Amino acid sequence: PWTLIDFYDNQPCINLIESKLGILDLLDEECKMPKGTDDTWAQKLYNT
Amino acid sequence: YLLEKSRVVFQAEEERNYHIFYQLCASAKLPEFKMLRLGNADSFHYTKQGGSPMIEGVDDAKEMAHTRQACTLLGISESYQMGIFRILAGILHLGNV
């Protein structure tokens, strides 16, 4: 039975990176917001 | 795929960008490269940032010849090889702007 094999899924981690509001998305969103900086980027990360 | 383009213009402590640039800078003594007005490998802003121009145990001056040999084995003409080196010298001089 397939129910015995538990599937470990790193999709939650990939979603943390590539999806909307992900660490890359907020980086691009920070690159075009006026006067964005590594510090405020980090703040967005914590907030989110 | 996935070429690390950012390395071309930025290097952390004791890193280097792509080897071809140091091969070229090491070749600044060769007659055909006189016109490229090359300096030493720390004279260029895109190569001096790492503070490690020489890899101990590696002759960039000879890797240049192995590179020219490989190009020629693939039939890239000497004209194209000089074009490549003209462009790379361009990138180096551009960084000094």
């Binding site: 590539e18 890359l24 | 996935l2 950012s6 074009g83 462009i87």
Partner: protein
């Protein structure tokens, strides 16, 4: 400006709004993300076989194995 150059190679370099317009605008991360999607769509169309190569010591010594 560069496309007008003196020797054949420089005009040759750019050869194949529209995609190439936005392409100049795309950030490195977005380019990477896309390049990775292309790689993934390439590999997902295919059957993988995997190999791992490991370095046993930092001094290039034959047949010596540093556990650390």
């Amino acid at each position: 400006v560069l496309k007008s150059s003196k020797f054949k190679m420089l005009p040759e370099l750019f050869q194949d709004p529209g995609q190439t317009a936005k392409e100049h605008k795309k950030t490195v991360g977005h380019q990477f993300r896309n390049s990775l999607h292309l790689l993934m769509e390439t590999l997902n169309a295919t059957t993988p076989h995997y190999v791992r190569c490991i370095k046993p010591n930092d001094f290039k010594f034959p047949f010596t194995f540093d556990e650390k």
